[PDB]
C-alpha cells in the first residue's frame, strides 16, 4: 500500500538522472489505479529510450526473425547482412516444433549472408540471388524463404523485394522479403508490425482462389502463442478436447501451410495481442473471420476462457468444454492443495516483454501470491489499459525501466519474487532474492493449460523456497 | 494430464498418448508434411560425398557460422578495466543481443550501454546521441571510464568517434579530463576477437601516446602481459598464479576475472577489480609486453612495437607443453628470474599424467573448432598426446595462420591425415564428420546438434562432441576452467580420456553382447 | 581377420560375424546353456520386491562389498610420514593385493614390504621373519622410520609386535634408537578406515608417549590436523591452502599428498615429503587438534584427550557450505586469526553457483554409497541443494554413525524419503534402486556394474553412475579432484549439475522424436 | 651382452643386501648360456621369498580363485575368510567371458563370508551352511559352488570339505572346497596345484559313467588359456578352421560342462603348462589323453603350433592347417611390413609369472626386437630349461627379483621397453622408460593368434615410439 510512499520512491529513483532523461522517465512509472481505465493519463509507452541507460529493449530484427518468422519451422530464414545477428539469435528462443532439422526443419539453424566489407561498398543484391540459389540446391525439401534484413540492408540501399521476385518468379517458390532493420523502431514491437504485415502481402493470401480444403463450423486458429517450452501444445489439446478443429497454429510449430489455410477458419484465438493484433485484424476486414483473446495461465483464467470459446459455438462444444472443466479439475485442485500453502502471501515483481506481465498474474493469485508491480519492455497505450485493471491498487507500474531504476524499486520494495528475463537474473540473484525467467520459463514449462499449472506450480514453489536463499550471509559477518 | 506426485515438464510430458495423438492428426491435416520415405531419403543424400563437394561449392551462403561480430569482443576487452562502462554507438538491439550471449555463457551479470541510435541518426548521424548517453551514462552509473565501441549502423554511416567525444567534452556533457577511450568496430570486418584487438588499441593508445616523452623502457621492472578474447577465468588466473609464482612483477592489461565471477553475498557489484589506469599509464616503462594471443593482437602489436618500442617476442600460446616452456623460458629471460621447482614438479607431473594416459589417447581423430589461437594450441597439445586431428576449421583464420598450422601439423608423423579449413562453418564440418567420421569433436556448444545429427544415421555414426571454446550453453561453469599453462594441459588431459572412457564404456554396457570388455579396470 | 589400417581391438574384434558364431556353437554344443528365456524371467525375478525382501534376510552370505580390510588403512596412513616404510607383518599376498589396489587408484608406484611369513610361521610364529625383515629392509631401501601393521594371520597366530620389534632390537637386527612403530590391525575388524585410525594411534603413541614431562599446551602455536583416510590429493592440497590462507601456523600429520604425486623427470623417488618425526614429537605442544574424519578417528581421539590433554572440538567433516563455516570458525577461535576476505569470496561464489545451478538440482534423487564421513557429508550437501538421497548405504556404519545420519535428515525438508542402511552391500543397492529408482548413484567404481544391471531391465530404468570415492579404475586422473572445502563443494556441484545436463542431452538426441526439448541453452 | 659386465652388475647389486639376504640372492640371478640344458645348475627356482625386500609374488589364494577357479562362469566362488582378499581380487583379473552377469554366470561379482570376531572365535562352518542355502536361494541358475579358503580357515579349525559334502548331497549340487590359504607355499603355484587337485577330486570324474556324449576323432581340449582380453578365443577360431572340435576350454570362458566333458577329449592342448601340468598329467595317466603344448604368440610360433597339431592328426586335419596358414599369412605379413621397421634393434627386458616370459618371445623377435633380460616370478626349473634355450647369449635371468633389484638392473642396461606388472609400471614410467602390462595386456587385446599379432605390434608401436618419452627433461635444467 502507501501511494505516497511508492511515489516518494520514485521521485527519489528519478533525483540521480540528468534533467532532460529525468524529466523523460518520470512519464513511463506510474503508480496504478485500478479505477482508471485510461493508461494514457497514467503512463506513456512506446516511445524512444535514453541514450546510455542501459534498457533491455531489442530491435526489429528481433521481433522479426527472433519472434514471429523464426519458429516457421518447413521455412528457411536469411539473416541479411553481418554475421552478429543471426549468431546471437540462433536457438536462443525455445519455441518448439517437431521436425527432421537439416532437412524438413530449419527452425535452429543459422542462414546468414555474412557481409564482408566488399558486400558493403558494392551491395549484395548478386550475392542474395545467387545465395537462394544455393539454398535451393542444399536443402530441396525447403517450402519457402524469408530474407530477414538487419542494419546495413537498410542503410546500403539494398533492393532485396525485386530479388525475391525475380528469383521466386523463376524457382516458382515463396520468398519473402523481411525490412526489420533493427534502427527502425524503437524496440521489437515495429519488428512483429513488419512481420505481420510481410505475411499478409506475400503469405497469407496465396490460397485465395482456392477452394479445395474441406472446412466444419467448428474451424478455430491459435494466433500468437509460439510454443515456448510446448505451451502451444498444451492449449491445443484443451481445444480439442472441447470439439473444435484447429486448422492453425502461428507461429510456433507452424507450418507455412496452417498460415495459408488460416483464412479458412471459422474463429481466431489470439493470445498475444501484442504481436499479431494486426494480421487478426486484417483478417476480420479482409475475410470476415472474428477473433477474440484467451488466456490459460491458471486454473481460473482457462477454465474462463474456456468457457468464452464455447459461448461462440453451439451447444455441443459448450457441453464439451463443461466436460473437460469437470475432467481437469482433480488435477488443478490437488495442485493448489499442494503448493498454495508454501506460497501464500509472497509477494512478485514482475518485468517482461508486451503479453506476459499481465496474463501470468492470475496464475499467481491462483496460488495465493500478489504482485506488487509490473511492466513492459515495449507495451502499447492498449496493453495497460489492459493491465491497470488486473492489478491491485498502489502497485507499481514501469514502462521501458532501466537497470538502475529496477534495482532500486527492487531494493526498496523487496519482493518475494521476481520475474524478467536473462539480464536481470544474475543482477538480482547476487541481491538474494529467488528469481524466475518469464520468457523462457527458466528452461521448464510449459506453464499454459491444466498440464502447465502443475510445472508452474513446482517451479515457483523450488524457487521460492530454496535452501540457497538462506545462505547468502556469511555467519561471521 | 498430470499427477501432483510426479509432474512432468515437456519432456517427457509430451510423448503422452493423447499428446502423440494430437501431434499426429496436427501433422496429418494441416502440415503437408513431406512423406517420411523422401525425408529420410534427402537425409541419406546429406550424409553423401556428393553432398559434401556441393556443399563446399558454396561462395555466397553461411550455414551455421562459428564466429561473432567486433562489438562483442569490444565489449569483453573493456569489461576488463577498473570502473569501466563499455558503450557501443549504435542500436540497442546489438547491445541487448551481446549481453544475453555473454550471461548466458558466463551466468553472471553483464554490463553494457548504447545511446540507441535510431532513423533520425540515420539520416543526421549520432552527436546528440554520443553527448546525451555519455551524459547519462556518467551521472546514472557513474563509471570511470566509459570506453567506445561502434555498431555496423554507425560504421556504416560514418559517424566520426572522435569528432562527437571533443564535441561533447567542449560543450559540456562530460568533464574534460573524464578518459573516453573509442575504437571503431565494423561488424564486416573480422570477428569478435578482431573487435577485441581493436578495443585494445583504442585504449592503449588513449593512455599512451600523448606521454612518451617521459617514459623509459624497462624502469618499473614488470612485464605486460595482454590476454586478448579470453572466456575462460582459469586462464587469467593460472598466468597470474604462474607468474607470482617466478618471483616476475607483471601488469595483467585487460583482466576482466573479477567483474565476471563476483560473489553472491546479498549486494551487486557492477564493478570489480579491473586494470587501472595508472597501469595503462605506466605500460610503456615495462621491460616487454607478451601477448598472450598474437593471431588477433597484430593491430596492438604494431602499436606496442612502433610507440612503446618494446621488443615484443615471437611466442605462440601457452597451450601444451612446450609452448608453455618456451613462454616461461621467454619470459625468465626478459626479468632474469629463474624459474622456480615448483613449475618443474608441475611440469613433471602433467608428463606423469600424460604417460598415463598415453595408451588409451594414441591414435584418436578429432575434429576441432574454435578461434585461431586456441584452435592452433590445441593441435599442438593433441600431437603432443600422440592423437590424429583430422578437421581443423577455423571460420575467422586467415592464410598466414593456416600455413603456420600446416607447419606445426608438418613437423609431427600425427599431422598426415590433418587438413586446414579456413572460412567454412559448421555445416562443412557435418558434411565432413559425415564422409571422413573422427572419433570425437571438440568446440562449443553448437557442435550438439551436429552430434544429433550423427545420431540420426545410427549410433556406429555418431561422434560425441567435447566442449571446450566459446560459447558452452548447455553447461554450467565450464567457464571457470583452464586452458593455458600446465594447469589447463591437465585438465584437457583428463577430459578428454576421460571422454574416451565413457564412450568405451557406453559401448560396452550391453549384457551378454558387448560386455566382455566392460571391465572394472581400464 | 584384422585389416593392416584399422585393428581392432577385442572390442569391437569379437563381434564379428566368424566369432559371432564360434561362440555360438561353443554355447550350443558344450556349455549345456540355460535356455534364453528362463534368463530373462531369472533376471525379471531379480529386479522385484519379493527379491528385494529375500534379499535383505541374508545374515551369512555378503555379495559385492564395499570396504576393504584394515592393513590397507594401515599401509596408506604409513606412506604418509617421511622417508617411512610400510611393513606388514605376516603373508606376501596381501601386500601385493594392496599395492595392486592403490596402483590402480592413484596410477603411482605404491612401496611397501612384507617379512612372508609361510606355514612354519603357523608353528613357530614370526618373530624370526620380523627379524630378517626389518633388517633387510633398512639395509636395502634406506628408511628413517619403519611402520609395522599386521595381517589376519598373525593376529589369529597372535603374534607380539612389542616383543618382537623389541627382541630385533636388543640383537642388534635394526639400531635401539631406530623408530619402528607398530599397530594391531586385524581383518576381521571394522574396515580400512578402522587400520588407519589403529596406524595412526600406533605412530603417534610411539613418538609422543614417554615425553610428555615437557609438553606444554599451545606453546608452538600450532593447530594439528588428522586427515584419517584420504585418497583425494585436492583435500590435503585445500586444508593446507584454507589453513594458509588465514594465517593459522597448522601441522598435518600423515600427509601422503607428496609421495602419492611425484613428477615424473626420469627418477624414480621412493620417498617424497611426508610428516617429519619432529612434527609428531612436536605435536603435543599444539594448541589443539582436529579430526577431520571423525567417524572412524574414535582411538585417535580417545589418545589425545587423554595423554595430549587437548580439546578435541565437535566438528564434522568439512564438506559443503555449513560444515566448512563451522571448521572456519572453529580454527579461527582456536587460533584468534580472523577469517580473511579471500575465503568470504570463495564462499560466496559458491553460493552464487548454487543459486545458478538449483533449477536443476531441486528434486533429484540419489542412492549414494562410501565411507562414513564421507557420505554424511554428501548427504549433508546434497540437503543443502535441495536434492534427496533415497538409498544411504555405508557397509562399515555402525549404529551411532546411524542416528547421527538419521537426525542430519530429520532436519531437512529433502529427508523425509531418505533411509540409512548400515551394514549392506552393492547387492543390497541393486535390489534397492530396482524397487526405489533413484535419479542418480553416487559412489566408487564398483556401482558401474549396477547400472549395467539396470541397463538390461531398460533406457527407462538405468541409473547413472557419478564416481566420488574410493576406488575410482575405470577414470583417470580423478584422485586429484578436491571433495574438502569450497572447492570440493565447487567440483561435486558442477560435476552433479553437468552429469543432470549430460544425461537429459543423451534422453533427448533422437531426431523428430525426443529433439524438441534438445535445447541449445540449459 | 658383455658376460663379464652382467656378473659384476649382478654383484655391484648384490652388495646392498646383507649376508644372509645376498647368499640367498646369488642363487636367483644367473647369465643365461643356451647350450645349458639343466636350469638346476645355474638358477634356483621355487624357493620362499627374503623378508622385508618387496617381492611381487602372490599367495595360493591368488593362484586358485583369482587364476584357475575364477574364470569358470557358471560357479560361485566364495571367499571363505575375511572380507580384504575377494575385493582386492574382484574383476583385477581380464577373464573374459560371455554370459549374464548375476544370472547365469558370476565372475565379475564378489562372495564371500565375511568373518567378523566371533566367525573368528566360535568357527564359520554353520555360517558356511547358511551362507550356502542363501546362494541357492539367491541365485537358482548358478551350476555349481567352489569356496576358496583364506588364511584364518587354515589358522582357525575350520572344516570345510565335510561341510561342503553334507550340503551338496541335500542339494543335490557340485560344492568344492578348496584349501587354497595363503600362507601355503611361497606363490600363486602352490594356489594353482591346490586347484587342480580340487578339479581333479570334485569336478573332473563325475561323468566317468556317463557316456551319452558324442565323439569325435578331432576332439581336442584348450587347457591353461584363460582368456586374456579374448586370448582363448582367438586361439580357439584357428583351431576350428583346421577342422579340430573344441569340447572345452580350460578356464577362461569355461563352464563347468566343459570341465566335465574334457575327459572325452582326443588330445589336450596345454598352454600353461606351470598352472594345469598337473592336471594335464593326471588326465594322461587315467584316461589315456595325450597332451602336448602349444604357443600362439606370434606368426612363426602359430605356424609351427598349427602344424604340429595337424601332424597329431590324420591328413584332412593338414591339409586345413596348410589352407589356414596360406589365408592368414598376407595379414601377418602386412603388419610385419608396417611396424617391423619402427622397432627394429629395440631391447626389451620382462618380468612376468610362469608362462609368459618366455612365451612371448618369439613375438618380439617376429617383429625384430632383441630380449636382454627376463624372469619369473613363481617358476619352477623346468620352465627355465625351456627359457635357456628360447633366450639368447650373456642375457639376464631372474627368479623373484625385488623392487631395488629389478630398478638396478634396468638402470644398468638401460631397454628400450620394460614388460612387467601393474606394481611395477609407474615405477619404470617415472624413469623415461617405455612400459607395458604383460599381465592384462594393458587393458588391450588378444595377444594370441594371427588376429592378436596385429593389435600386439600396434601396442608395442604406440608405447615404444610415443613423444611423451622425448619430453622428460625441463628445457631449463
Ligand atoms: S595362469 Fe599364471 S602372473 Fe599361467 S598365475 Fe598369473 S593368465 Fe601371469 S605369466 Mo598374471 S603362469 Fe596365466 C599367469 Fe602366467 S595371472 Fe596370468 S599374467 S599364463
Ligand atoms: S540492431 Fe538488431 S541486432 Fe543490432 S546489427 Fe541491427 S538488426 Fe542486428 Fe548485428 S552484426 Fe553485430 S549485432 Fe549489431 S553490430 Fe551489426
Ligand atoms: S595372503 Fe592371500 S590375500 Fe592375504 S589374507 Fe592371506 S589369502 Fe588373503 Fe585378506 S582379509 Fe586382508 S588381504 Fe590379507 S589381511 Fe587377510
Ligand atoms: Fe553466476
Ligand atoms: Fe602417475
Redesign the interface.
Known amino acids: 500500500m502507501s501511494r505516497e510512499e511508492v511515489e516518494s520512491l520514485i521521485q527519489e529513483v528519478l533525483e540521480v538522472y540528468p534533467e532532460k532523461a529525468r524529466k523523460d522517465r518520470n512519464k513511463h512509472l506510474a503508480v496504478n489505479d485500478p479505477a482508471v481505465t485510461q493508461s494514457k493519463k497514467c503512463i506513456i509507452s512506446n516511445k524512444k529510450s535514453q541514450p546510455g541507460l542501459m534498457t533491455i529493449r531489442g530491435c526489429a530484427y528481433a521481433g522479426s526473425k527472433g519472434v514471429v518468422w523464426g519458429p516457421i519451422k518447413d521455412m528457411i530464414h536469411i539473416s541479411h547482412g553481418p554475421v552478429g545477428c543471426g549468431q546471437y539469435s540462433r536457438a536462443g528462443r525455445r519455441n518448439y516444433y517437431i521436425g527432421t532439422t537439416g532437412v524438413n526443419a530449419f527452425v535452429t539453424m543459422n542462414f546468414t549472408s555474412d557481409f564482408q566489407e566488399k558486400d558493403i561498398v558494392f551491395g549484395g543484391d548478386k550475392k542474395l540471388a545467387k545465395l537462394i540459389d544455393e539454398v535451393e540446391t542444399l536443402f530441396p525439401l525447403n517450402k519457402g524463404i524469408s530474407v530477414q534484413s538487419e542494419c546495413p540492408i537498410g542503410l546500403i540501399g539494398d533492393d532485396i523485394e525485386s530479388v525475391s521476385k525475380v528469383k521466386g518468379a523463376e524457382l516458382s517458390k515463396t520468398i519473402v522479403p523481411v525490412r526489420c532493420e533493427g534502427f527502425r523502431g524503437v524496440s521489437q514491437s515495429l519488428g512483429h508490425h513488419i512481420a505481420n504485415d510481410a505475411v499478409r502481402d506475400w503469405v497469407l493470401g496465396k490460397r485465395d482462389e482456392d477452394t479445395t480444403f474441406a472446412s466444419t463450423p467448428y474451424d478455430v486458429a491459435i494466433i500468437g502463442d509460439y510454443n515456448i517450452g510446448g505451451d502451444a501444445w498444451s492449449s491445443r489439446i484443451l481445444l480439442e478436447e472441447m470439439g473444435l478443429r484447429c486448422v492453425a497454429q502461428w507461429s510456433g510449430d507452424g507450418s507455412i501451410s496452417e498460415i495459408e489455410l488460416t483464412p479458412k477458419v471459422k474463429l481466431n484465438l489470439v493470445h498475444c495481442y501484442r504481436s499479431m493484433n494486426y494480421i487478426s485484424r486484417h483478417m476480420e476486414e479482409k475475410y470476415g473471420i472474428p477473433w477474440m483473446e484467451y488466456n490459460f495461465f491458471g486454473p481460473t483464467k482457462t477454465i474462463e476462457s474456456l468457457r468464452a470459446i464455447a459461448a461462440k459455438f453451439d451447444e455441443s462444444i459448450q457441453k464439451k468444454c463443461e466436460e473437460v472443466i469437470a475432467k481437469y479439475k482433480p488435477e488443478w485442485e490437488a495442485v493448489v492443495a499442494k503448493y498454495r500453502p508454501r506460497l501464500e502471501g509472497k509477494r512478485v515483481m514482475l518485468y517482461i516483454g508486451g503479453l506476459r506481465p499481465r496474463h501470468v498474474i492470475g496464475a499467481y493469485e491462483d496460488l495465493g501470491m500478489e504482485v506488487v508491480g509490473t511492466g513492459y519492455e515495449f507495451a502499447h497505450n492498449d496493453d495497460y489499459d489492459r493491465t491497470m485493471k488486473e492489478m491491485g491498487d498502489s502497485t507499481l507500474l514501469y514502462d521501458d525501466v532501466t537497470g538502475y531504476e529496477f534495482e532500486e524499486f527492487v531494493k526498496r520494495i523487496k519482493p518475494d519474487l521476481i520475474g524478467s528475463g536473462i539480464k536481470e537474473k544474475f543482477i538480482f540473484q547476487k541481491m538474494g532474492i529467488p528469481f524466475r525467467e518469464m520468457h523462457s520459463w527458466d528452461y521448464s514449462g510449459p506453464y499454459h493449460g491444466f498440464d502447465g499449472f502443475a510445472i508452474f506450480a513446482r517451479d515457483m514453489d523450488m524457487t521460492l523456497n530454496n535452501p540457497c536463499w538462506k545462505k547468502l550471509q556469511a555467519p561471521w559477518e | 494430464?498430470?499427477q501432483?506426485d510426479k509432474?512432468?515438464?515437456?519432456?517427457?510430458?509430451?510423448?503422452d498418448q493423447?499428446?502423440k495423438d494430437?501431434?499426429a492428426?496436427?501433422?496429418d491435416?494441416?502440415?503437408?508434411?513431406?512423406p517420411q520415405d523422401?525425408?529420410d531419403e534427402?537425409?541419406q543424400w546429406?550424409t553423401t560425398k556428393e553432398?559434401q563437394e556441393?556443399?563446399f561449392?558454396?561462395?555466397?551462403?553461411?550455414?551455421?557460422?562459428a564466429?561473432?561480430?567486433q562489438?562483442?569482443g569490444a565489449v569483453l576487452c573493456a569489461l576488463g578495466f577498473e570502473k569501466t562502462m563499455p558503450?557501443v554507438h549504435?542500436?540497442?538491439?546489438?547491445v541487448?543481443?551481446?549481453?544475453?550471449?555473454f550471461?548466458?555463457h558466463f551466468?553472471?551479470?553483464?554490463?553494457?550501454?548504447?545511446?540507441?541510435?535510431?532513423?533520425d541518426?540515420?539520416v543526421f548521424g549520432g552527436q546528440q546521441?554520443?553527448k546525451?548517453?555519455?551524459?547519462?551514462?556518467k551521472?546514472?552509473?557513474k563509471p570511470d571510464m566509459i570506453a567506445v565501441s561502434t555498431?555496423?549502423?554507425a560504421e556504416?554511416?560514418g559517424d566520426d568517434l572522435n569528432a562527437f567525444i571533443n564535441n561533447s567534452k567542449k560543450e559540456g556533457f562530460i568533464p574534460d579530463e573524464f578518459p573516453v577511450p573509442f575504437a571503431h568496430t565494423?561488424?564486416?570486418?573480422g570477428?569478435h576477437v578482431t573487435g577485441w584487438d581493436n578495443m585494445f588499441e583504442g585504449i592503449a593508445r588513449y593512455f599512451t601516446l600523448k606521454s612518451m616523452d617521459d617514459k623509459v623502457v624497462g624502469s618499473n621492472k614488470k612485464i605486460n602481459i595482454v590476454p586478448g578474447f579470453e572466456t575462460y577465468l582459469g586462464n587469467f588466473r593460472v598466468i597470474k598464479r604462474m607468474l607470482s609464482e617466478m618471483g616476475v612483477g607483471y601488469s595483467l592489461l585487460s583482466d576482466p576475472e573479477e567483474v565476471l565471477?563476483?560473489?553472491?553475498?546479498?549486494?551487486?557489484?557492477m564493478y570489480a577489480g579491473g586494470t587501472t589506469q595508472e597501469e595503462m599509464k605506466d605500460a610503456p616503462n615495462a621491460l616487454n609486453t607478451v601477448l598472450l594471443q598474437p593471431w588477433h593482437l597484430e593491430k596492438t602489436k604494431k602499436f606496442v612495437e612502433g610507440t612503446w618500442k618494446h621488443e615484443v617476442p615471437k611466442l605462440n600460446i601457452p597451450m601444451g607443453?612446450?609452448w608453455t616452456?618456451?613462454f616461461?623460458?621467454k619470459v625468465?629471460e626478459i626479468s632474469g628470474q629463474?624459474?622456480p621447482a615448483s613449475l618443474?614438479?608441475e611440469?613433471?607431473?602433467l608428463?606423469?599424467?600424460?604417460?598415463?594416459?598415453?595408451?588409451?589417447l594414441?591414435?584418436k581423430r578429432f575434429a576441432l573448432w574454435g578461434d585461431p589461437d586456441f584452435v592452433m594450441g590445441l593441435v599442438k597439445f593433441l600431437?603432443?598426446?600422440?592423437c590424429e586431428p583430422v578437421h581443423i576449421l577455423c571460420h575467422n583464420g586467415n592464410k598466414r595462420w593456416k600455413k603456420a598450422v600446416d607447419a606445426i601439423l608438418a613437423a609431427?608423423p600425427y599431422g598426415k591425415n590433418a587438413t586446414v579449413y579456413i572460412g567454412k562453418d559448421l555445416w562443412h564440418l557435418?558434411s565432413l564428420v559425415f564422409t571422413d567420421k573422427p572419433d570425437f569433436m571438440i568446440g562449443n556448444?553448437?557442435g550438439?546438434?551436429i552430434?544429433?545429427?550423427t545420431?540420426?544415421k545410427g549410433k556406429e555414426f555418431e561422434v560425441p562432441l567435447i566442449r571446450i571454446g566459446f560459447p558452452i550453453?548447455?553447461?554450467?561453469?565450464?567457464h571457470?576452467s583452464t586452458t593455458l599453462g600446465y594447469e589447463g594441459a591437465?585438465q584437457i588431459?583428463?577430459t578428454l580420456?576421460?571422454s574416451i572412457?565413457e564412450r568405451?564404456?557406453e559401448?560396452?554396457?550391453?549384457?551378454?553382447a558387448?560386455?566382455?570388455?566392460?571391465?572394472?579396470?581400464?
Open positions: 494430464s498430470q501432483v509432474i512432468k515438464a515437456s519432456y517427457p510430458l509430451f510423448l493423447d499428446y494430437m501431434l492428426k496436427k501433422r491435416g494441416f502440415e503437408e508434411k513431406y523422401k525425408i534427402v537425409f546429406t553432398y556441393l556443399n561449392q558454396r561462395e555466397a551462403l553461411t550455414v551455421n557460422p564466429k561473432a561480430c562489438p562483442l558503450y549504435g542500436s540497442q538491439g546489438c541487448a543481443y551481446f549481453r544475453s550471449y550471461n548466458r551466468r553472471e551479470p553483464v554490463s553494457c550501454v548504447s545511446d540507441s541510435m535510431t532513423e541518426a540515420a546521441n554520443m546525451d548517453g555519455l551524459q547519462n551514462c551521472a546514472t552509473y555498431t555496423c549502423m556504416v554511416i565494423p561488424s564486416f570486418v570477428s565471477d563476483t560473489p553472491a553475498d546479498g549486494q551487486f557489484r607443453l612446450d616452456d618456451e616461461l623460458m625468465s629463474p624459474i618443474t614438479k611440469r613433471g607431473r608428463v606423469d599424467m600424460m604417460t598415463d594416459s598415453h595408451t588409451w594414441h591414435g600431437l603432443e598426446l600422440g609431427s557435418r556448444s553448437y550438439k546438434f552430434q544429433r545429427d545420431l540420426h550453453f548447455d553447461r554450467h561453469h565450464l571457470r591437465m588431459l583428463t580420456v576421460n572412457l568405451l564404456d559401448e560396452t554396457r550391453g549384457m551378454q558387448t560386455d566382455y570388455n566392460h571391465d572394472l579396470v581400464r
